[PDB]
Design an enzyme around this catalytic site. Structure first.
Site, mmCIF file in Angstrom:
data_model
loop_
_atom_site.group_PDB
_atom_site.id
_atom_site.type_symbol
_atom_site.label_atom_id
_atom_site.label_comp_id
_atom_site.label_asym_id
_atom_site.label_seq_id
_atom_site.Cartn_x
_atom_site.Cartn_y
_atom_site.Cartn_z
ATOM 1 N N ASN A 1 -2.727 12.932 -3.557
ATOM 2 C CA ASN A 1 -3.867 13.347 -4.376
ATOM 3 C C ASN A 1 -4.358 14.738 -3.990
ATOM 4 O O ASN A 1 -4.660 15.561 -4.865
ATOM 5 C CB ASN A 1 -5.008 12.328 -4.270
ATOM 6 C CG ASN A 1 -4.777 11.100 -5.132
ATOM 7 O OD1 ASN A 1 -4.193 11.189 -6.216
ATOM 8 N ND2 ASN A 1 -5.232 9.942 -4.651
ATOM 9 N N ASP B 1 0.842 -1.195 0.000
ATOM 10 C CA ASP B 1 0.000 0.000 0.000
ATOM 11 C C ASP B 1 0.876 1.243 0.000
ATOM 12 O O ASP B 1 1.854 1.318 0.752
ATOM 13 C CB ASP B 1 -0.945 0.011 1.213
ATOM 14 C CG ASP B 1 -2.072 1.047 1.091
ATOM 15 O OD1 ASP B 1 -3.241 0.700 1.407
ATOM 16 O OD2 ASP B 1 -1.795 2.210 0.704
ATOM 17 N N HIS C 1 -5.267 14.302 -8.519
ATOM 18 C CA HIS C 1 -5.511 12.959 -8.916
ATOM 19 C C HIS C 1 -4.772 12.500 -10.050
ATOM 20 O O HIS C 1 -4.480 11.440 -10.079
ATOM 21 C CB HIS C 1 -6.925 12.724 -9.135
ATOM 22 C CG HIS C 1 -7.684 12.715 -7.893
ATOM 23 N ND1 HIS C 1 -8.305 13.821 -7.431
ATOM 24 C CD2 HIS C 1 -7.912 11.755 -6.995
ATOM 25 C CE1 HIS C 1 -8.894 13.542 -6.299
ATOM 26 N NE2 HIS C 1 -8.639 12.303 -5.996
ATOM 27 N N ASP D 1 -2.250 9.211 -9.872
ATOM 28 C CA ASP D 1 -2.371 8.257 -10.839
ATOM 29 C C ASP D 1 -1.137 7.959 -11.493
ATOM 30 O O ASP D 1 -0.978 6.965 -11.827
ATOM 31 C CB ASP D 1 -3.351 8.756 -11.824
ATOM 32 C CG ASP D 1 -4.721 8.382 -11.541
ATOM 33 O OD1 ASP D 1 -5.047 7.974 -10.491
ATOM 34 O OD2 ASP D 1 -5.515 8.478 -12.392
ATOM 35 N N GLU E 1 -4.874 2.355 -4.150
ATOM 36 C CA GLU E 1 -3.423 2.371 -4.044
ATOM 37 C C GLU E 1 -2.859 1.051 -3.520
ATOM 38 O O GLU E 1 -1.705 1.009 -3.082
ATOM 39 C CB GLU E 1 -2.979 3.529 -3.149
ATOM 40 C CG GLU E 1 -3.527 3.446 -1.739
ATOM 41 C CD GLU E 1 -4.787 4.281 -1.531
ATOM 42 O OE1 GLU E 1 -5.536 4.483 -2.511
ATOM 43 O OE2 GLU E 1 -5.032 4.731 -0.380
#
Ligand SMILES: Nc1nc2c(ncn2[C@@H]2O[C@H](COP(=O)(O)CP(=O)(O)OP(=O)(O)O)[C@@H](O)[C@H]2O)c(=O)[nH]1
Ligand SMILES: [Mg+2]
Lengths: 260, 125, 264, 122, 121, 124
Positions: A146, A138, A151, A155, A181
């Site tokens: 973010n 993770d 975002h 990404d 994630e």
């Protein structure tokens, strides 16, 4: 025949009597005898030529018969070879099919492909008896990435994390995006002691990423939980143990890797 | 008389020969490694069915990809059906296909070309 | 044939003529003419029977020939149908491969392609010792393009950049779409010194581009960071160094191209 | 006794002196028809001249070339010669039922034979 | 002009060219009906006036009767040649099939006129 | 009297070199009309085997072969086997990339009925 023999002999004795020579009936008798000899000669020749013709025909039919059975076997051989070529075309087709169920963003196997492999490795954990290692990974503080950067940025960090983890796996290892994630790493036919080095390398590759946003460079880290498949349990149970391990790594700070 | 049930795999079709119904059904891809071991019992079932009476025989195909000897076997079966039809036996065939793959239907047309018995090429709707 | 009839006719006349009736040869000639008629019938019969046998054999042979021809057809039909199945399969595989490795907008190779090729070039480097160079290119101020002329205009711009870069590359070089407005050049079996000229031609190519959007003709610059693959290093670490070089290009003022080397 | 073994292209022939029977089997495409059928004609003549005991011929012939048909007609002629002289002689012709045409060919062989000529399906 | 069928040969008697041409398999049922004209045509030509006669043959199979009729025609050609009439015959055949050629040499043994047995691909 | 067929995306490149005595083919073979493609190859092979006695060599670098193509290749092989049985020196070399595993056993099937020199060769 035999009556024909006796008649021909009587006729020939008549024909040898000089008193009839020149007589028209003598001429006709002689002409008929001669025509008989000639017909016999003509028959001998006819029969010989015809015999040869039907000998030729007999051999032509035997040759066509051989050709016919060789045709049967040739159709079976063409089909056999073709089937093998098509087996290669099928292996290609299945590879591409499985290669198109990829997470659109990162290009990694998705959850579904992860579940499918998990089930397949559970079964091989029975029949061959070597279990697999399962790591849940993770991104730390992804929400901060973010919120701060957007975002789009987040990404991208995920796309590059996928690149880096994939680069550090051995041949039969598997890296997938579980969701958000969260990624799942699967090392088949391995046990924790062999796992440690590869997992250290995978965290390294996430650690040393320097992902550009405009003119700044981001640094991120990953927490990871590790365990081993305990055979007979379900993949699900195994996942859950990896998940609890990961939660423990997050409890004890960031950039950590706890085993369970 | 027999019921034929051949379980499909991923490389070989599922086949069901229902003797009371008079129906031979086939589904799936057909890449058998040993074509004779798959299809010989099928051709034999069709022969036995045709020889045992004059009840009709319907083939119900949901076939996908056919390799070469599968194609050859399907024609062998069509040959038996064409002979039974020429002699007065009612026989027939339905070939189902997904409408979104219309090349399949031209392939079926090729199988149908020399068949004079009812041969219906059908989209899933 | 002419002569056998002419002769039987002459004999007919002889046998009818009353002056011969009673001669010692008359009766003989009648008997022998009769015998010849029988022999002729025997000869014709022989032929007829023989002709019958050959008709039988022929009929059999024409049956076999018809089978042979059926077989031929069957083979040609089986092969044709199979060929068509394989063409459909081929088209399906082509579309799937295209979708997995080619970028829809630009036609360039995609990330997957690149990565895949980057793996196999790292392996090649290892064994044969031949390295590749990596050039990572990022469009300067692209956002101005999108904000002034729209994203469709920027898309045209990216297509034109792709065309221009591919036109200055050698045939085994690889230009891939790496990001929204990033491109990864892989020059296989190439060293930096040989890369310099090609890369400078690529940058000239991009620089001199003029993409027409209605009443305006857009020009752009790109930053680019380039490195050489160092053996004993994963392809991802190569990519990372090319990327850091790109960052230095970007920090140092744009329309720049910085190389990274290795202090011993 | 006469015994000639059959080949791929010539018939097996058995002339049994004691039972008084000539039997023939197979195809007949002889290269040298004289050398083959002369022995047969000679045997038949010698038997017919030896002493009034009956002759029957048991033929399982299949294909016959032209000179073989001539040889068969010679043999049938000798049989009809014996028959019109009171000698009990006869023949049966055995043929596959599924071959229509062998029967009609055998009939044409029979057409001028007055002795018992029986054509036989099996 | 006699059109050939699958069991009959195609025959063409060119009066002006002076040519008798024959093609195909010969298994006629009624051999006389077919070959009697041909023989009548042949002798009508031979009696009509000293023009040369050429036979152009590519027959395949000839049954017994057909062999007999062919020898009748060859007899006509031979007696013509014996009287000074220019007559010739050429028999073509597929080379893969030698057997026909001998058979043609068999037909030729009693012919003293030009008799050429010619191959073709 | 050479034979040159340029190799498209779906059809193989074929060079019949007459005085070198060599038929060479390279590539995939998915021909839409197989007659048009292979009939001139079969005619060329037949011309060469009939025109004299120089030896013939096939050198192949073929890839995927659909069913009509397999058939035509067997036709060609039959021509070679016939010439070999009558004394003519003929030979074939099948080149394949070692990576393809299964190609070799395909070739071996092609060669099972071949009395003449038929060499299968891995070439990297
Ligand atoms: N027209 C398109 N625009 C894109 C596409 N992908 C990304 N973009 C836009 O690219 C823009 C590029 O932003 P980046 O920060 O580079 C901004 P800028 O170009 O200004 O770069 P630097 O000069 O390098 O700083 C970004 O806003 C993207 O949304 C695309 O596929 N088409
Ligand atoms: Mg930019």
């Amino acid at each position: 025949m035999s009556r024909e023999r006796e008649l021909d002999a009587w006729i020939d004795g008549l024909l040898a009597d000089p008193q009839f020579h020149g007589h028209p009936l003598h001429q006709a008798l002689a002409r008929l005898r001669q025509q008989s000899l000639e017909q016999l000669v003509r028959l001998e020749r006819i029969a010989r030529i015809s015999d040869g013709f039907q000998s030729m025909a007999r051999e032509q039919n035997l040759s066509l018969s051989e050709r016919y059975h060789k045709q049967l076997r040739r159709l079976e051989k063409v089909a056999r070879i073709s089937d093998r070529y098509q087996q290669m075309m099928r292996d290609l087709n299945l590879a591409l099919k499985e290669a198109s169920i990829r997470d659109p963003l990162t290009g990694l196997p998705n959850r579904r492909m992860l579940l499918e492999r998990l089930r397949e490795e559970n079964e091989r954990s029975q029949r061959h008896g070597q279990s697999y290692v399962l790591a849940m990974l993770d991104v730390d503080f992804f929400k901060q990435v973010n919120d701060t950067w957007g975002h789009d940025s987040g990404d991208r960090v995920l796309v590059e994390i996928a690149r880096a983890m994939e680069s550090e796996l051995r041949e039969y290892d598997l890296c997938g995006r579980w969701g958000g994630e969260e990624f799942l790493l699967l090392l088949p036919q391995t046990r924790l002691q062999d796992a440690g080095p590869v997992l250290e390398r995978v965290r390294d590759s996430v650690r040393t990423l320097a992902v550009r946003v405009g003119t700044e460079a981001l640094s991120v880290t990953a927490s990871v939980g590790v365990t081993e498949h305990r055979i007979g349990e379900t993949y699900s149970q195994t996942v859950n143990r990896a998940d609890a391990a990961l939660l423990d790594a997050k409890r004890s700070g960031r950039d950590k890797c706890v085993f369970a | 008389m027999s019921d034929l049930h051949i379980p499909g795999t991923q490389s070989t079709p599922a086949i069901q020969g229902d003797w009371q119904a008079g129906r031979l059904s086939m589904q799936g891809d057909s890449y058998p490694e040993n074509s004779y071991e798959l299809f010989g019992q099928v051709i034999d079932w069709v022969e036995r069915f045709l020889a045992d009476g004059q009840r009709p025989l319907e083939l119900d195909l949901r076939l996908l990809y056919l390799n070469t000897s599968s194609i050859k076997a399907m024609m062998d079966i069509l040959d038996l059906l064409e002979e039974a039809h020429q002699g007065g036996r009612p026989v027939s065939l339905r070939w189902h296909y997904d409408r979104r793959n219309e090349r399949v239907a031209e392939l079926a047309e090729e199988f149908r070309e020399d068949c004079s018995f009812p041969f219906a090429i059908q989209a899933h709707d």
